[PDB]
Symmetry: D2
């Protein structure tokens, strides 16, 4: 059984070759996205694997898939026109909840200890003193609020509750197994009571700009906001006003609305990076990361490996569909 | 029953009045140092309490103290170097300190720096802001903490608290202490110094500072660490030979470092209006490094810490007034 | 809208009356099973709700159901096998898949800690020998120096892992399927190794034909003499004869059971003759290194609350042409 | 540098031998108390180690020890009442902290066993032949419960870390404040602990002022559903009061490792019926009580630490150290 991969980064490669040899399956690979110009590669292959940057719109790819004997298209992570697939599609539902959870916790502790604000005082004003307004506090004294909790949210809960924190959380769906770690309550209560706020809901039209002005005047003025989920969840401009006028204490971001413009690219001009970004990046009580929350060996390993072993069971007869 | 308080900063005040209500003790307060000028205020007090900025230099102070009948000089800090003890025995004067005030403050700073470094955060921001580069390079992939072993040198209040925390998160904690405490076995495994350095993905210092501990971390010790590993010092600068740490980072002996305290820190931390002349190249060299984070000995700086420095001090002195001797007494 | 409930227990009532006054919904109830007779109360209902002990084997029930404009049968348990599914082509079926993982994880843990401390063994020497000494063969250990092994790890296996891991024990586990969300709490490994290394072996696979009698002689001899076997899963995972033999010979050090092969005769029954109660129960039950409970791992307020509320909320969702995921 | 050891038991033997072997000391041993016949063994030795059952009250032994030229009496327990300090005039060292988690774990174990009603169920199964689930034997998940500690030291705090990890709310009364401890518990007053906890655990030391600290008034103050755990010291509880409160439904059950008046039979065999007390028998017959014979301490770790902390203390003595274990 032969497999054909697409969109591969050099970092995915080692784990690919480790699976290739471990499951004793022939694998062919390439960094380029799957097109009509690269379908020729899935010859013999029991499956094609993608990790798409973009839509695979043109439909003759599918024609060639089922003509070549490909049983399945397996993603490593909606980019698939599902109408044309009537081939089996698969995804990678879960790669490392702890990855994004750990980034979340990290950004929140950095801000809490107000490290960014101290380094500014130190480096620009040359002020190595301890001001009344920069006092910090222990994590167990705080109560954390989560807007949306799934695989990523719950890992965040287990960690903070473990550190002694009260976690309170709003989700439209009751999972009982989470009760050891958090108290379910309403949206507003979460915003009102929480010293750290972490976004973990999905992205839908209804959820776009979930967080804007109201919310921020509504947060504790001493609260920090954490978004390791999707930039479209936050009204960015709103955030920027909120921060300036001090309606929150800080924000930690792994993502911003319109991030695809510059996240993932290199060698940009001052002109190609947006001012809202440039403005936040400059705030000592903010931290931004280039959507890197997902980026651990475990994430990489599981993005490749889950999909290939799946792909092996499809060259014979799993839940990923 | 009366206590005189010195060196009070605004920030202590609410814990001060708070404690004075909780216990029914009368408190006189001042933001000034204890000297010949101000010893007056100790009148009819059982104890004075300080958070000193310098030696208590004047014999007169101690004499006039035991002459008022002040039983004890309570410090609101661990440090008692600022007290002349020849003279505290000469005047039959007790001295107390606050040795333990908020271990989780520091353990939490420790963890925070570890995690920040581990997620390469400062290194991404660098690529972002200065090379205008937002890609994920190969060498900046991170790992989850439950896959790592964290290594403590010195396991005291702070060390064990680091252990309970990183252990709560599933990391393996190994540690070297000269002293065995069964209390800590649920959270760490004791090993030897050499091994802690050798096996650890994170090395965190928590031994006290002695002559026998000055420069405990040096060239040989940074050579023995992993290329991948991070050095954390939220303990004391003097544990680290700074030049050596610089050399190690530059030479890629280790991957990064988190510092709350520096050797020779005492001449710049907690100063303002410094001009480049008065801040060292030591600190400058470390601070431009994306894989280094430095805080200004702020590991302790939480409301719990401040509060406890007030209240632990004041109840220690209240029990001295009552005729007790608290273990906070310095001998 | 209307929902009718059968198999209701006194304990369920408050939680139900709460969902009821909360959702603006009529609920009519009865302690007795769904049948030819009692189908008559499902009139006008969007749904019925069951917690059955027998198959609902009468066709008439189903037909009169689709006759009343009843949309769904919602089980308040996991096991939907008490439904004939051919006839449900008339009718939707929902279940309550997860209600308290932790209820069972905490029973599991309690029984382990109890044997590990040898309290039943001590009370035996105190009460029968008038002996209050402390013998060599009764020394115990701290949980963090022991390694806990899981055969099968689901919602329950992971909750258990979470707890033990949190107390500082090492956890190993065998599951046919890989779940990344469990790595902070356990290490995956092979079946054999779970048995060979563990000090406590707990079972959390599901009952299947290919799984019936998972634990027999081979496996018990392979466990550590000092190990403890926990079954808070399903009795049929364990061959009672083999278990009895092993405990008797010292091939394992003890066992905690909430469940037993054959248990249906007597679990759930009162006023029993000594005949009505089988000898293997009485034999394990006479042993001080055994603890047994009557299939109440599940039994907490959280489980009752959630078994009622999840199922009703699902029924409402289906009363509004919703389709919550507990469609079966 | 040679050591004499007294009171050794079969289980200690191995850690003794492994430590003498690891540190190059010779040790001599004997199972009887140190008195004036066996003192003859401590000749040439730099220190002794006992684990006493009753007072060393012979003066020959003290001055014969300082004649043989021994420097300290190392105890392998916390309890020093047995050494006479008039006669030590000789240093005395004890072993103050040997395995907090051993006691904290018995505390937790007993607490979970109670909380899950395994004893009450065992009674209904074995005496009533009743294998059903009653309303009063509904149980609860630990994270929904709150744990109150009277007294918080090495042990009470270890109990706190454990219950905190499981997600319970922990609260404690102590006369002293321990910053190290705020992550696991919240300090408060005595009344409040009794008033709000679903489990009460005793961890205060025994002092004249603490004798009968939990008695009639305090038990009326606890909740009908609360359990009392005493893995601390029996004289802390008024057994009469406790028995009668259990009888009246003032509390829901209790878990005990120690009893006011235990030293008559705990650690003995084989008593007559007259020799095991009425109170004990009353409690032991209560399915909602659990009683272990002061085995809370009794682990591998504990035995080991008792031996090795004492011997190494004694070795730092022979080379001229004066370790903090010195009690004068």
């Amino acid at each position: 059984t032969k497999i054909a991969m697409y969109n591969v980064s050099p970092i995915e490669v080692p784990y690919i070759e480790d699976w290739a040899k471990k499951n004793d399956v022939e694998i062919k690979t390439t960094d380029q996205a799957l097109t009509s110009a690269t379908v020729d590669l899935a010859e013999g292959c029991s499956s094609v694997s993608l990790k798409p940057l973009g839509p695979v719109d043109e439909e003759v790819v599918y024609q060639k898939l089922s003509e070549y004997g490909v049983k399945c298209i397996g993603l490593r992570i909606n980019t698939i026109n599902f109408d044309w697939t009537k081939l089996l599609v698969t995804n990678v539902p879960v790669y490392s909840p702890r990855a994004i959870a750990e980034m979340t916790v990290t950004q929140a502790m950095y801000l809490l200890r107000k490290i960014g604000e101290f380094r500014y005082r130190m480096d620009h004003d040359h002020d190595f003193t301890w001001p009344s307004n920069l006092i910090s506090n222990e994590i167990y004294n705080l109560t954390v609020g989560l807007i949306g909790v799934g695989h990523i949210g719950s890992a965040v809960a287990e960690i903070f509750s473990a550190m002694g924190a009260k976690v309170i959380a709003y989700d439209v769906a009751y999972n009982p197994e989470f009760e050891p770690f958090l108290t379910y309550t309403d949206f507003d209560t979460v915003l009102k009571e929480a010293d750290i706020v972490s976004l973990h809901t999905p992205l839908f039209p209804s959820t776009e700009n979930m967080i804007g002005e109201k919310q921020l005047k509504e947060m504790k003025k001493s609260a920090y906001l954490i978004n390791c989920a999707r930039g479209e969840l936050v009204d960015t401009g709103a955030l920027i006003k909120a921060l300036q006028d001090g309606e929150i204490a800080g924000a930690g971001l792994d993502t911003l609305a319109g991030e695809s413009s510059y996240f993932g690219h290199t060698g940009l001009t001052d002109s190609e990076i947006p001012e809202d970004y440039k403005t936040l990046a400059k705030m000592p009580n903010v931290v931004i990361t280039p959507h890197s929350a997902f980026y651990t060996e475990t994430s990489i390993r599981n993005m490749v490996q889950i999909c290939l072993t799946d792909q092996l069971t499809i060259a014979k007869g799993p839940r990923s569909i």
